[PDB]
Amino acid sequence: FSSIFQRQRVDALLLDLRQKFPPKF
Amino acid sequence: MYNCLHSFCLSLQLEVLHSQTLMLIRERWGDLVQVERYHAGKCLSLSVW
């Protein structure tokens, strides 16, 4: 019939962005 | 929208600059420049001479 392994720092920055700017439904 | 994407981009730029300084300290400079303070997303402070 990838991930360049500098993404730990970007991810921590994403968490800081989540806290500094929260989502709002 | 501007506040969120400007704050994220500026702290991204600070992270890039910190990674560059760690590259310079490891590879070529080495104790000719030292990181004094680094608060992620807040400030970076280097020491020369």
Side-chain angles (χ1 to χ4, degrees):
Chain A
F1 310 120
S2 87
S3 178
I4 86 188
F5 317 117
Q6 184 188 17
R7 321 294 212 190
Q8 49 273 9
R9 320 189 69 180
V10 188
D11 274 327
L13 178 50
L14 290 178
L15 297 174
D16 303 1
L17 187 61
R18 294 179 188 181
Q19 171 146 355
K20 201 196 296 177
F21 291 85
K24 291 178 182 69
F25 297 92
Chain B
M1 173 215 62
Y2 188 80
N3 283 120
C4 183
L5 301 145
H6 190 90
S7 43
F8 168 67
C9 273
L10 285 194
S11 169
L12 180 65
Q13 290 180 358
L14 271 183
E15 280 267 5
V16 162
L17 294 201
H18 187 80
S19 59
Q20 285 182 20
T21 48
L22 296 178
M23 289 310 285
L24 297 201
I25 288 184
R26 174 203 320 156
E27 289 174 329
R28 58 172 70 163
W29 288 66
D31 203 67
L32 304 181
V33 61
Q34 307 152 313
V35 176
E36 293 273 312
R37 278 89 55 84
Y38 171 53
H39 302 284
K42 160 72 182 173
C43 81
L44 175 56
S45 80
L46 301 154
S47 65
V48 299
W49 282 6

